[model samples]
Target chain A: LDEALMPKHIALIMDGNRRWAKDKGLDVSEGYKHLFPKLKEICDISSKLGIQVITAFAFSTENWKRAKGEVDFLMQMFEELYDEFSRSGVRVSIIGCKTDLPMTLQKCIALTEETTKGNKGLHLVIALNYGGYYDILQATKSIVNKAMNGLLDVEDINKNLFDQELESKCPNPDLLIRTGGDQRVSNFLLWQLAYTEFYFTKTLFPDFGEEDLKEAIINFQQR
Target chain B: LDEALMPKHIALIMDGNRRWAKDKGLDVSEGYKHLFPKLKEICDISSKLGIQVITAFAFSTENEVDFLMQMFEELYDEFSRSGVRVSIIGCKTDLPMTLQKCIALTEETTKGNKGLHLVIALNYGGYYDILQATKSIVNKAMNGLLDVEDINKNLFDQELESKCPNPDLLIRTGGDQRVSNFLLWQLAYTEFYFTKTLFPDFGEEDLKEAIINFQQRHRRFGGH
Candidate 1:
């Protein structure tokens, strides 16, 4: 019953993996490989807790500016997950720009989005090219164009209504979680989280475990 | 040094007041009254921090739905702050019908915007006011009310532009995370900082703490 009060959709700013891997004295790719099971853990926990959707800010468009080696390794990691998780029952979709991404990663994203488009489990939404301002801007363009075309009036606009303008029309995120001691959302899903709850912890994302998640649920429950 | 990174604008969704009053074993109005100095302190601190703007979700248009006595007291508290820091710098325009009268006093009382923005989000909400502001700006731009260049981020979007540079630091003194009808358009790139502190009890230290949190962030502005 308490879990029902849990956010139907939990949006996460998953951070601190490189630092976590460095701290653990493990290869960066090894650190990346280990996160796959945790993804499953999050989906399973959300399902058990009745959270219908779980969206995590994964690869950011800004990530391309990072060191080339890091970007290459990260893409390789995602390709593996794209192959593995697409077959999982959970639905997966990546929101962001894909044109600049490698064809292998693009194919991976396509296959995953297609295979799981029909699934009915905890949704795993990965914000790839995602940005809150970008999302709203894209939506605002459509809205403004609509208004210019005699579709929407100035009075017809509201927070709820303007939300449809965003890329992910998934109902507004209920709880926004940022891990690894980061307190801000960092350009994650902006238009979708107008009233979402915030939950932060000192724990890093790679080290995120069931116990930490349970406590987050408990904390959210108190809200 | 840390203050420079502070947002040019920030808005808070002030929540958990009745609960706060109940916990204090006092009337909610009394609790509301005590929050005055905290407001004064932050306004001063914000100006000192070089913040170009600061906005607060002080009162809501829906405030009338609350107890009348409660509503009046809040207005009185806002009015009372005229002698304090930011309250003295006033020129209120674009207030809705219910607050139209307070609008006059808000202008007359404040010492005319001493450059420290203390935008009391009184009877103000994000979506509603933005619509109104957009209309006013459009009127100014289209009707040859001003030069085309005047339509930039400058040009008074009505009274809100009276607060300098738009609010870059939003501080809500309750445990909620939503902007709750705070400045929607103004917060285009403003960084957000949330805390569980309750208002009336949230002191300057807590306010500074929010600023401290804002200072730590890396402002990318869409580019990596």
Candidate 2:
């Protein structure tokens, strides 16, 4: 039973949009647009590589600090992308607290998730307004509520039990790749990245191509 | 006005002792011994540099529990007698009796000194840290010491082993850019600095270089 296989779940931290826009001397929305095709490409490649899930950090809870115009642009992108994914028969899961999001965008995400419920293709996960600690806190509260109400036992509160409460169906990421030269996880899937092999690249998200994906695969293979 | 500053708490994941020993054609224990002086030197330097707390990953939970635990027990007594205030941060229940007493004695003897708060992470995992933190909160709530609704970030912060403050900068050597289950909850907003230098080779110069790099980094802290 000597076999070396690819990771089932891969997490991508989408970074360098503003920097990419600055490099191109264009509106930040233009840089965000560059990632649309790239997202499609990554999804296609993951399926070809026999990877099951691909979770991309579309937006962070910390990212609300960005400019208002850019945030609005991102909101529009989320709605349009939801429609796009639905048409392509891709099952999409918007993993984050939707209560804080714009109503139109929240409804769009729900529609897309419901529309592609039966797709056998790639499961595209988008982390929007997500924070790792917030995820943990929310999960903890759910457990605490259950424990206090005598619905769950203290010993029953474990990794598997906690895994059920996370926003992602896939709780553990086998490999975590962050682009744009930053080396930190930046609070994306803190609980999941315990033993994940990390790959960091200076390549801006827009410039990340097939070669970059292949490189990350080779690096993961070594580990 | 721009201010250049070092991190208040500099947490380190010292890796590659086995690799360092294998490379040197020496025993693994030899590689481990080299860290004592290196640790002292780094602690002394941090004290002079005005850094408040330094948490060093002396041994991982993945390591052979007996082998390294003995090594660290010997280390604590020597370091403790030299007036280095040490705080052992990890699951105390997981360690053996000898190792436990050494840790207790080290903390007691060095408790009065206020130079550098050297935090030794033995048998530590980040996931475990969060779990323990949650368990403590759960215990408090169950005992009526704390209300379930009152559990918040500030309340959770007091439960962590590194209760001093969250690490401002986390340094990992040995060419690996992974956190390796070192500090999960504490490292939420911490800036990471990775270097290819082996832990044995990582010295004062390398630390200074990393500190300088840290100084130049623009910390937005979730806001611009």
Candidate 3:
């Protein structure tokens, strides 16, 4: 692996889990089960390889439009998997709307945050019920408040201040990878992905392993 | 030509003009000379092909603004005379008076046209575009005119320069895979088409091919 030459921040859109299950001749659970483990595995690999921050699009606000069974199962999976994820030494955080998620899932998020609060390893950000537009909307509200209070002027507000108002504590992504062949951003990180290099792969999410991640990183260095 | 399918709005990032000139043993003036003529021809083609709105990034925020104004005098004369309703988008205050006057003259002259909606973005950046909109809404909220609750996605979008419609397709040439701050907020749902062909090589045939490629893709707005 090209260790020192790596992106400081990497944002991933984990796609094609359902298709992976279909190909395996199993149910969605078979596809879903491998997701958390893969996330952990990648985090370990990336952090060890010198990447600082890693973000995975765990669930999107648009995912709510999916079937009730699928949504419920996802929440249940989150509840079960977060406990396993809430270990010490890895700084785990959630960056999304808390009120939109289920109470159990919210509690799981809080637990994981508190569990890893003292850690100083890879900063792993999990996005649940997140939308890029939603982030911008929330940030603009703060700008309105600032202008109303005379703390900031409309003319003084710029990209730096606007970026500060975003929910992500980490810097903007340097490399954005999407598995499952989609070329579009799908409304993900519109503001932050201004100059980010995009890499789309046909490899499904569940099957994308450490070797695949290494290959993608190598490809990024070339660009 | 895929006459049956067309995007309602198309945004273009014209790149590699200087590189194209350098490769041809010419100067930036040669590149500048081709800009307006190619733009007019594309506008005609887009309008005739039934595309409603076409926005092009003629000058970036990083461009030398004064040099562009002197180069574009002839373009202003033609744009004012032509009936292609032209609207300028970007930070106007940063521009020189001559360039601003030219832009104003063309805009006022083309105000009554109903044919094609051609938008020219000069000295523009996508983050700057969104920041300006955000600042405007913030100012309104401060002045007790608009409530913060009223500043949702649609209202915020209306404050941006390209308020006509969101771009359905975004085409970037010169082999760039990144957006480079062209139309960030407007490109949330835009299908991107990147080509290695530089600006001079991009013509009616290239545009038609890109549109055909656009038509072949399945546009799913998030949900499967």
Candidate 4:
């Protein structure tokens, strides 16, 4: 029966934030403020949709190569988001490399994750400096650490071991949706998406209203 | 400057077929049937795009569960496609489980192996596979079926050990870009991409399109 039902975890590559700002002739910072309600909308809908977990590629390791101004703006938005959404019903957690974020902002993120470590409404998996292989390396590194620490009695470490370690994060995504076209995970959550369904749309994030979201969910369900 | 360039190694999930077909009031078979030539066109355009190493995911381990009629049809297409003998590299190899321990132990003995090699992961990885393989080896050693004489360097080699080379290229067609354990070892030094084209829709033509996009890339290979 479980096989007949739709997937439990859903992932999204939320592209086009600056593009959204550009189109509206708004500053990049202003562009991000508008994303909160949209995020709340996705979380609420996802919770209602019976999706157990939802991961969003909020930033990536390759993203650090972006213009300093835009990158700074992204950091500001990230901290602002943690402060604002920390108390929300959704269980907020962060993953990916955090070495690049400013120290204070890192603490804020650490605090936010510590604060909202519980909540079953919607588990938000945020990929900050995440790339698929990068995530895999860190995960396998931990497994290796485990091996070195005598926590793992093993003779091997490879893709299979890597798979177990990556799924060690919450659970593997069930369906991955990349909005605003340009198909590619772009090194987002690579190893965790082995068998997940995917849905791509031309709808920009701002234009990605509940109905468009609904259709994608429907399409995924039927698939 | 490379920021504006296109992606390489193009890993794709090749998803949405079962639904794309349903939306059109057709079966999944029709969806795949409609998807193949589109891949060809993608390749046709890719060659012009200056891309290389287009790897199309025609099937995955989990795909074994799909409707048999559709599955059989797609397999037939793959067989036919392979028959064309238009081989750029023939079929991509899979890294199924056979030998174990020695892969890690060799590396353990040579923990600092700095050799440059390409990697690929296939057959939908599971930790149990390696475990079982290792268990088999241990069983052999315990049962006196194998000994120090029977062991050697290549003793742990699998079907995919033959292609282990360096700074390789990778191209994954279809939509999703995650590496589905597809040649995890061989694709190590490769670049990757995920395309919008479906597998059935993908053929040599679509593959060339991805290849063209790849050739223009400048690989950093983890350079700071």
- Interface RMSD per candidate (angstroms): 4.8, 1.8, 1.2, 8.4
User: Tens-digit lDDT track for model 2 on B193-221?
Assistant: 98888889989999998888888777765
- The model with the greatest DockQ is 3
| Candidate 1 lDDT, A135-205, residue by residue in tens | 64455445555555667676666656665666777676777777767555666765566567777788888
DockQ for all models, in order?
Answer: 0.19, 0.55, 0.70, 0.09
DockQ order of candidates, top first: 3, 2, 1, 4
Which regions of candidate 3 deviate over 4 angstroms? Answer: A1-3, B64-66
**TM-score between candidate 2 and the true structure:** 0.93
lDDT of 1: 0.63
Tell me the deviation in Å of residue B48 in model 1. 5.2
Deviating ranges (above 4 Å) for candidate 2: A1-4, A169-171, B1-3
Predicted structure with the largest lDDT when compared to the true one: 3
- Candidate 4 lDDT, A93-127, residue by residue in tens: 77776776788778987888888887657788777
lDDT of 2 by residue, A21-103 (tens): 88979887888987767887788877877878889998888888888887888878877876467777567888888899999
lDDT of each: 0.63, 0.80, 0.82, 0.55
What does the lDDT read for residue B43 in candidate 4? Answer: 43
CAPRI rating of model 2: medium
Q: Model 4: what is its DockQ?
A: 0.09
